[PDB]
Amino acid sequence: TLEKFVDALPIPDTLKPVQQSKEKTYYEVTMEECTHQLHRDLPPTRLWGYNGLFPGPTIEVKRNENVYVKWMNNLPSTHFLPIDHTIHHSEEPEVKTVVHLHGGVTPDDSDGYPEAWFSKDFEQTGPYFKREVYHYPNQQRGAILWYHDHAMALTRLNVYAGLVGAYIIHDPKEKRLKLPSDEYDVPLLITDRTINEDGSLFYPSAPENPSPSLPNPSIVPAFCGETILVNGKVWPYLEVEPRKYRFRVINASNTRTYNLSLDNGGDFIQIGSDGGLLPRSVKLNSFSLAPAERYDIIIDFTAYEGESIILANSAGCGGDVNPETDANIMQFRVTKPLAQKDESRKPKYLASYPSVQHERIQNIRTLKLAGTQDEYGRPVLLLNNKRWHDPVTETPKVGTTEIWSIINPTRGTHPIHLHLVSFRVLDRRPFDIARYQESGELSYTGPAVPPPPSEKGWKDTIQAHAGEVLRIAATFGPYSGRYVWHCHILEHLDYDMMRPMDITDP
């Protein structure tokens, strides 16, 4: 296997605007097929990248900054990864793209609707396409966001190809907290990959030892990569100064959940979740990170000068974790001389509690994670046993607050994501799976459990564990329009665990 910790961690450059005034910031980002070396010992890999980079450029904005991004497709007309033609039926181009700013408080036509896709130079566009230049008003809490492809029936492929990047909203009001900043504030985009000897990406064309009933290529219900990359390098190292760093930890993997720790037994300090700063900082020895979740953390290397510390992983993917491979994420080497005094802080008091809000519960929505089997014998994962194309059923009214009760009778965790909003986690409660499957009756096998401190802030992607009912609360706004909610396991999303979400203005 590839030698661990021989390549330095890339830190994507911050994107520069094409035009900028006090009133408007204008960016251009072009999707390009490009080649990059992923490891010292590999030939360069063919990838799809925003501005031809993997990951794409980091975009940094201020809260309330009036931002526009013209996301453009300059990709080849044929994919290099295996397309399953059976999972969607519409004339249409093979390669479709659309960019979703994950966590963005964004008008619907700029949100990256799956059917708002476009081909090269916008030659062909999906039925819900409205505009070329996306508008991000950024009227939301400072937070770690990220952007990635969201094209109908292609998300697992386009994201795997390399179409992911970081987007950070800086609230000037947070500067007084003196959190680690500038070179001491570093995004970590974690992506698992399987790479062939010739350097080319491997993505399966079919399930392992496929049934003759299956089409070719065929979608698979999960992908587990043999290798872990951070910021587009296999098992990299980062030289750090002996001081406090802020890391924006982003799970940009298709399926894989990580459970992260430091191999010396040191602690993280979590300061933020998907939706921004937690009300209080939280000292953690480990944390779970499912696809699309973000942890905003401080690691304090002050007492560890000279040491090599591995960011380790205990969560398996399709089996037990391998100590020599996927148990490793990256290695910190505390060997960089201090550039200046560490004047950063790790404050306890960060933000207002979500519980300060006292919104009336307009609706309680009961939702189940289910599915069926297709003509080829493959599982089709479905929210409420409804297909993507079935008439919309999740229709919250703008400005109103709802409780969503997510029932998971399946065998695994699904990281559920709602567009537009960030939400509060209320509780999780275990139930009798067999009784639910047989009668549809919900019988609890234990008391409700409140969220861990890590989930007492704002979330937009939430782990709904097997055999539990998860309750969340969201205020639907400030915009009305057509959005989506879905599982962020991309192999599930594409077939067919995604539903429209209409925020209405009556």
Ligand SMILES: [Cu+2]
């Ligand atoms: Cu996403």
Ligand SMILES: [Cu+2]
């Ligand atoms: Cu999203």
Ligand SMILES: [Cu+2]
């Ligand atoms: Cu799922």
Ligand SMILES: [Cu+2]
């Ligand atoms: Cu989405």
